[PDB]
Design a protein around this ligand. Structure first.
Ligand SMILES: N#CC[NH+]1CCN(c2cccc(Cl)c2)CC1
Ligand SMILES: [Cl-]
Ligand SMILES: [Cl-]
Ligand SMILES: [Cl-]
Ligand SMILES: [Cl-]
Ligand SMILES: [Mn+2]
Length: 340
């Protein structure tokens, strides 16, 4: 039977089922006030699927100049054409190769660039913004979005949205690498999975994905969602409460010193965006500092709500197109205030 919502993370994560239900705010606002992330499923069913395909981005925008990142070693591939990324998104025999002769796991950096999404892709901009869940929070002029209403005593988010495009991580060694390293944002955000590409040709990485989910600490109901085999999994997230950010900084200063890094006692390993918490580090955070997080598998059409100040990291299981919008809820406005 259709239902309004369910729970993941053993009851610690709200999952809303109908992205356009006018009563979602009643269930959402209690969890949100407590500093929890929230998941909303089904947004892909609201969108024009032909606007969110890799082949369309390559056809329309392929001659633009861009930089890529090699996810395995953080090397920058400078000043290549955006088609060199898009044409290898699903077809492994078309990917740029490292020296070792393997196909690379690449991230497309800052594309569309800065605040240019709306000007470059007006039809994509309209399709996303008209279908975002919790619209009183997430639309540029929603009644519960303070972004347009705050003085300069508050850090205001840039004009969005922002697209996040990267290949899936493949090997056993890749399990310890991030697509996006551990960081935090002073604004709230909603991140929507608009396309998942599951490859062919050398796309025999389905088996190692079914060991990542597990070691990633995903709950039994999420696992039930993986093992049912009805929906496409895109990315594994770990999110931590804003209140636990300093304890995470303490762990990462201890680990940096153990690994012979030479850092001042006050430096900020979360702002540096240089760490990915692997299974070893997540267990050390729990055992040594008493910190628990949320392990979230984002499927096609899932919207992840990330609270302001909450440290978070992202690991792509398959090739993903994500689109994110920043907003400033009244519940979390303290995180962007410039004093005390
Ligand atoms: N729409 C659709 C059909 N989908 C094909 C891909 N399926 C898949 C493939 C690899 C891993 C996991 Cl968990 C799921 C899900 C069903
Ligand atoms: Cl908070
Ligand atoms: Cl467009
Ligand atoms: Cl709303
Ligand atoms: Cl990163
Ligand atoms: Mn972020």
């Amino acid at each position: 039977s259709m239902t309004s919502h369910s729970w993941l993370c053993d009851g610690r994560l709200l999952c809303l089922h109908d992205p356009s239900n006018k009563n979602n705010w009643k269930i959402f606002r209690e969890c949100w006030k407590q500093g929890q992330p929230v998941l909303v499923s089904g947004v892909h069913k609201k969108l024009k699927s032909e606007l969110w395909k890799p082949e369309a981005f390559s056809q329309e925008f392929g001659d633009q100049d861009v930089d890529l990142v090699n996810c395995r070693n953080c090397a920058i591939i400078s000043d290549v054409k955006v088609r060199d990324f898009w044409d290898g998104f699903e077809i492994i025999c078309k990917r740029l190769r490292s020296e070792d002769g393997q196909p690379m796991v690449l991230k497309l950096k800052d594309w569309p660039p800065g605040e240019d999404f709306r000007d470059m892709m007006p039809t994509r901009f309209e399709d996303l913004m008209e279908n975002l869940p919790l619209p009183e929070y997430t639309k540029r002029d929603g009644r519960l979005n303070l972004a347009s209403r705050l003085p300069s005593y508050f850090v205001r988010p840039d004009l969005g949205p922002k697209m996040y495009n990267a290949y899936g991580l493949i090997t056993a060694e890749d399990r310890r690498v991030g697509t996006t390293n551990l960081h935090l944002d002073v604004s709230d955000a909603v991140n929507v999975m608009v396309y998942v590409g599951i490859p062919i040709g050398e796309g025999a990485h389905d088996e190692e994905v079914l060991k990542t989910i597990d070691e990633g600490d995903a709950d039994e109901v999420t696992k039930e969602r993986i093992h049912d085999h009805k929906e496409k999994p895109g990315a594994l997230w770990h999110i931590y409460a804003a209140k636990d950010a300093e304890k995470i900084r303490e762990l990462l200063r201890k680990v940096g010193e153990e690994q012979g890094q030479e850092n001042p006692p006050d430096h900020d390993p979360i702002h540096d965006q240089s760490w990915y918490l692997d299974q070893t580090l997540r267990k050390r955070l729990y055992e040594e500092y008493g910190v628990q997080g949320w392990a979230i598998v984002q499927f096609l059409g899932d919207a992840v709500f990330i609270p302001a100040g909450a440290p978070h990291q992202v690991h792509n299981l398959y090739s993903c197109i994500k689109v994110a919008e920043d907003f400033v809820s009244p519940e979390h406005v303290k995180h962007c205030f410039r004093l005390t």
